[PDB]
Amino acid sequence: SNAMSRAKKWVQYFLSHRHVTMELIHKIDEAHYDYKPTPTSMTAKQLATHMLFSFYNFANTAKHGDPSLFRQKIEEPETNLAKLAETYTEKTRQLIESMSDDDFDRTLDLTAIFGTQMSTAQFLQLAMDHEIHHKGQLFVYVRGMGHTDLPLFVKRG
Amino acid sequence: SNAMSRAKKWVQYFLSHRHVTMELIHKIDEAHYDYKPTPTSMTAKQLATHMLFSFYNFANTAKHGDPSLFRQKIEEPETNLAKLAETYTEKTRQLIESMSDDDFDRTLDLTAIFGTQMSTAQFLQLAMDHEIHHKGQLFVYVRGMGHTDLPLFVKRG
Ligand code: NI
Numbered sequence: 001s002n003a004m005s006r007a008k009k010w011v012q013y014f015l016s017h018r019h020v021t022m023e024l025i026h027k028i029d030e031a032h033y034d035y036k037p038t039p040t041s042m043t044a045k046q047l048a049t050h051m052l053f054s055f056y057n058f059a060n061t062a063k064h065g066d067p068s069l070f071r072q073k074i075e076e077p078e079t080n081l082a083k084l085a086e087t088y089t090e091k092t093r094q095l096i097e098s099m100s101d102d103d104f105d106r107t108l109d110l111t112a113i114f115g116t117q118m119s120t121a122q123f124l125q126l127a128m129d130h131e132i133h134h135k136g137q138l139f140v141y142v143r144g145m146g147h148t149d150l151p152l153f154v155k156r157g
Numbered sequence: 158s159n160a161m162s163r164a165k166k167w168v169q170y171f172l173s174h175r176h177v178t179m180e181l182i183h184k185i186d187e188a189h190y191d192y193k194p195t196p197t198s199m200t201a202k203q204l205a206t207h208m209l210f211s212f213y214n215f216a217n218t219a220k221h222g223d224p225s226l227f228r229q230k231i232e233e234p235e236t237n238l239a240k241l242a243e244t245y246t247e248k249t250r251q252l253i254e255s256m257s258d259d260d261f262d263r264t265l266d267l268t269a270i271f272g273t274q275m276s277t278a279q280f281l282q283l284a285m286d287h288e289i290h291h292k293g294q295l296f297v298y299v300r301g302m303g304h305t306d307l308p309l310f311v312k313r314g
């Protein structure tokens with residue numbers, strides 16, 4: 001029988017990147033929450049928050065096959081990035097882990113949003129691309145704040 | 158005969174990102190070739206070059222199922238980024254497009270390099286993650302140079 005479900009594969013793929021995101025987030029102290037590489041860039045706190053919430057929305061939508069969920073506003077009082085990070089990483093992990101293998105084949109009607117329909121797997125690949133994209137930026141932020149010992153962009157696990 | 162048009166799917170996936178990379182590269186004039194967001198960061202030219210060459214090596218290696226190709230040094234006189242970009246984007250596109258669907262299942266012995274064996278498809282996903290990762294950084298560079306009208310990080314359709 002299969003050693004792992006699709007869900008389990010996606011979760012490992014997710015974590016191989018999100019773990020790095022979290023390592024980077026821990027290098028950001030309150031003093032740099034509002035750091036910006038450029039005058040028109042997001043603050044570090046904005047960037048990190050956007051990554052956590054946006055991915056949660058992708059997973060949430062994917063899990064429930066419901067496109068309306070996608071732009072549902074997340075209101076969270078947490079304030080402390082690191083705690084926020086661990087909270088939403090766990091919520092996101094659990095959503096994905098709870099999916100069946102057919103769920104990944106379900107078609108999502110996203111014309112209203114991406115102007116197109118899409119398999120749940122393509123949709124999740126988009127969420128990954130989005131996370132990897134922003135993590136790349138986060139790398140630049142963190143070096144800008146002066147940190148030089150940075151993790152590999154992706155974890156061997 | 159390739160029932161899944163794997164190559165063709167990968168190519169479309171590749172281009173949906175590489176096209177944005179190229180749009181960004183065109184916003185970089187010779188005057189900013191050596192721009193760096195931080196004193197310890199790669200220059201814009203170094204970053205863009207690294208993306209073009211690294212991906213070419215992934216594809217090259219994938220196409221020929223030959224791990225030795227991977228760290229083969231690329232020597233290129235071009236100098237002009239944009240031309241370099243279009244040249245290597247086309248070479249990369251052609252390599253991937255010329256692959257059969259079984260090629261994507263071939264196992265690559267990469268212990269010497271990543272300390273692990275890997276399917277060609279996982280290997281190509283790594284190449285994509287790497288491109289997306291660096292394109293994220295390139296976005297920070299380009300805003301830093303002063304450009305504010307930036308493409309979406311990925312082109313759909
Ligand atoms: Ni975003």
Ligand code: NI
Binds near residue numbers: 207211287291
């Ligand atoms: Ni790299």
